[PDB]
């Protein structure tokens, strides 16, 4: 699989590393994919540039 995670800027380096590890782990466990075919991209955005459920930041 290829998992792209769009998150707000601001997490520490250790937090981002652990998130990638955790994404790999839960993908492996839930659908059985060998880590060898799991690919992860973490991308950070300003909160202003993201809207979930039609919500405008601020």
């Amino acid at each position: 699989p290829f998992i792209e995670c769009h998150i707000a800027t601001g997490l520490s380096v250790a937090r981002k590393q652990q998130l990638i590890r955790d994404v790999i782990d839960v993908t492996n466990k839930s659908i059985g994919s060998d880590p060898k075919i799991i690919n992860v991209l973490l991308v950070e955005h300003a909160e202003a540039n993201m809207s979930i459920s039609g919500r405008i930041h601020g």
Binding site: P1, F2, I3, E4, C5, H6, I7, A8, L11, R15, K16, Q18, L19, D22, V23, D25, V26, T27, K29, S30, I31, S33, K36, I37, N39, M50, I52, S53
Partner: protein, 62 residues
């Protein structure tokens, strides 16, 4: 947050439910964001559409 997962076609609804539950939990835990503020989309395609280290994958078999 927004999460997408591109993977081969063929996973069951039950497998997709387990995947979403897992990814939502770990993203929520990392970011401090409630599940209310997370969106997730799965995108599916044929095996030939997936290339890992230059090799095209076979179709998934559930």
């Amino acid at each position: 947050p927004m999460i997408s997962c591109d993977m081969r076609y063929g996973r069951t609804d039950e497998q997709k439910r387990a995947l979403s539950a897992g990814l939502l939990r770990v993203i929520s835990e990392a970011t401090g964001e409630p599940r209310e503020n997370i969106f997730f989309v799965i995108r599916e395609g044929s095996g030939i559409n997936f290339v890992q280290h230059g090799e095209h994958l076979p179709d998934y078999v559930p």
